[PDB]
């Protein structure tokens, strides 16, 4: 089976250079052009450029001229994209794709994506704050000041799964904030305890925060 | 000029079993050189149709494409639960290769005003010298919404962190979290903390507030 395997998530500093890889298996690497695509918030897809592995011919989107450089390593059937002078604008998920299949070709096989986060941050555990205040009551947990992603949240160790909203984390001033809400009947709180469990594997953190009335 | 692909409407709301058509319009004639992709979360784009109408091995028969020149259409002949997500068109007739901005295929439901809850800073955060005020704007539909923070009746935009959920897998609604962060010193210089939610469900914003000194 045709497989495009990309290198792992990257946590890089502003101004750095980074090279990310797209390693193929199951077919002849030099058969088809490779393409790189940037997935940014929206979601939004942008085409960066293409390289013809058989001869090194390229075509670039002018928007990425200088920023991104394409290459191939035929000895290892691996396509590479190199970024220079990284900024927060370059934080995105990058995909490689081949332009093959039955004739006429199209972007038929894709890599799994490579997440790139450009930040000056160091691994930092989260602070977990309680969110305490109808027929229903909403409680929550505010997860701030941590790095990197991911942080995962459960309520009562997964026993409270209905009426939960866990929001995507957002990076602001080189630290993340995440929040999670839970809605329970007003009659059940504070009599039935509500606790968020916050896991941050990067910092070896797993903490509980019980929500109590103000 | 780069070929501009316009996908309009940006959001199509349907129910499983409906027949749907998605539009991709080109700024200049591109013959049959349009391809369609499905895209979910941060996963790889998936090729559905190539060269406006050509089928792809393994793609279910319910997906078809038609059109030529500048007017293209992707059709789903009876929408299945697995089909909700983003649909992007792409042109390969001219350099640089370009994508449309995407159409979100979402689950249709009845409009719902957000359930708004506001929370003062926790004593734990205050002890650390910080003050975050959180508003959850939960289970609303449709997705567009605006939040404004007012401190002592004055709009505040500094220190606001917003996050939005994808469409809820259980009830087809959307949620939003908004966190306003101040220092403890700045938080104590004011009394009223308000978050105003503007949504299509009412001509009046939902106004949730608290007074610090209460």
């Amino acid at each position: 089976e045709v497989q495009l395997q990309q290198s792992g998530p990257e946590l890089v500093k502003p101004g750095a250079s980074l090279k990310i890889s797209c390693k193929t298996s199951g077919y002849t690497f030099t058969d088809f052009t490779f393409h790189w695509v940037k997935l940014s918030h929206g979601p939004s897809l942008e085409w960066i450029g293409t390289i013809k592995p058989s001869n090194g011919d390229t075509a670039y989107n002018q928007k990425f001229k200088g920023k991104a450089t394409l290459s191939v390593d035929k000895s290892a059937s691996t396509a590479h994209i190199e970024f220079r002078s990284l900024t927060s604008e370059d934080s995105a998920v990058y995909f490689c794709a081949r332009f093959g299949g039955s004739y006429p070709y199209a972007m038929d096989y894709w890599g799994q994506g490579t997440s790139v986060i450009v930040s000056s941050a160091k691994t930092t555990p989260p602070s977990v704050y309680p969110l305490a205040p109808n027929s229903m009551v909403t409680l929550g947990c505010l997860v701030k000041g941590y790095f990197p992603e991911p942080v995962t949240v459960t309520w009562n160790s997964g026993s409270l799964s209905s009426g939960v909203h866990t929001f995507p984390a957002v990076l602001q001033s080189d630290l993340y904030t995440l929040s999670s809400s839970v809605t329970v009947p007003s009659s059940t709180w504070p009599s039935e305890t509500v606790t968020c469990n916050v896991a941050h594997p990067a910092s070896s953190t797993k903490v509980d925060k019980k929500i109590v009335p103000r | 000029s780069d070929i501009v692909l316009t996908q309009s409407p940006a959001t199509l709301s349907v129910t499983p079993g409906d027949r749907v058509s998605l539009s991709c319009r080109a700024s200049q004639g591109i013959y049959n050189y349009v391809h369609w992709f499905q895209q979910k979360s941060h996963e790889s784009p998936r090729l559905l149709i190539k060269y406006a109408s050509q089928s792809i091995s393994g793609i279910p028969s319910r997906f078809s494409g038609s059109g030529s020149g500048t007017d293209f259409t992707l059709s789903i002949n009876s929408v299945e639960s697995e089909d909700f997500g983003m649909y992007f068109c792409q042109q390969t007739n001219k350099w640089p290769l370009t994508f449309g901005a995407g159409t979100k295929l979402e689950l249709k439901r009845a409009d719902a005003a957000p359930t708004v809850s506001i929370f003062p800073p926790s004593s734990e955060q205050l002890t650390s010298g910080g003050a975050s005020v959180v508003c959850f704007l939960n289970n609303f539909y449709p997705k567009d919404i605006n939040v404004k923070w007012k401190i002592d009746g004055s709009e505040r935009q500094n220190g606001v962190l917003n996050s939005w959920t994808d469409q809820d897998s259980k009830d087809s609604t959307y949620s939003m979290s908004s966190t306003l962060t101040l220092t403890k010193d700045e938080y104590e210089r004011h009394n009223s903390y308000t978050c105003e939610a503007t949504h299509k469900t009412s001509t009046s914003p939902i106004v949730k507030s608290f007074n610090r000194n209460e």
Binding site: T33, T50, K52, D57, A59, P104, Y105 | Y33, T92, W95
Partner: peptide
Amino acid sequence: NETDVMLLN
């Protein structure tokens, strides 16, 4: 058809 030389041939 400026992209065929690169993409298809």
